Amino acid sequence: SGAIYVGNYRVVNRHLATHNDWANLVWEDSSRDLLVSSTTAQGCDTIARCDCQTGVYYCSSRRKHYPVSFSKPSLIFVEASEYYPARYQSHLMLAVGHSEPGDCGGILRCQHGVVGIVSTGGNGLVGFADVRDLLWLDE
Ligand SMILES: COc1ncc(Br)cc1CC(=O)N1CCC[C@H](C(N)=O)C1
Ligand SMILES: [Zn+2]
Numbered sequence: 794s795g796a797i798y799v800g801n802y803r804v805v806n807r808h809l810a811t812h813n814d815w816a817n818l819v820w821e822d823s824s825r826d827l828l829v830s831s832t833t834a835q836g837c838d839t840i841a842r843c844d845c846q847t848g849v850y851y852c853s854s855r856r857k858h859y860p861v862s863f864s865k866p867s868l869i870f871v872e873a874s875e876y877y878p879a880r881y882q883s884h885l886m887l888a889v890g891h892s893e894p895g896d897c898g899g900i901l902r903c904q905h906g907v908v909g910i911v912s913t914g915g916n917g918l919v920g921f922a923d924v925r926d927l928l929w930l931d932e
Pocket of ligand 2: 841842843844845903904905906
């Protein structure tokens with residue numbers, strides 16, 4: 794679990810969105826596993842605007858942060874789950890690292906700010922849904 798709080802927005806994995814998230818829907822994309830809902834309280838997370846390929850992610854299944862090198866956002870094939878059939882997920886970045894299903898929502902950050910959130914994993918690889926292209930999160 795986990796979210797990014799920026800301005801009047803809440804960014805979560807789409808497969809984990811709540812009833813309140815859908816009732817206050819701003820934007821959602823199944824192909825990216827992202828959902829953004831509006832909030833009354835103001836968020837303070839800084840979104841990174843960069844092309845960094847190194848950062849640190851929070852892994853709740855180990856109560857630890859891990860440094861990783863990650864790929865550039867791209868279309869990656871993701872196995873079927875209870876939330877989606879087998880498909881290509883877009884804007885996905887992979888790193889060699891540990892994750893379990895409950896790790897989705899952990900933040901990946903670089904020196905410039907928040908890069909994305911854990912979205913997929915398996916076989917010793919962790920995938921993060923990039924959010925750096927969503928320029929509107931700041932305005
Ligand atoms: C961090 O997730 C995981 N990590 C390790 C294993 Br094994 C398994 C996972 C779960 C995972 O990859 N999923 C399930 C939930 C929806 C996901 C999606 N974006 O399509 C795919
Ligand atoms: Zn950066």
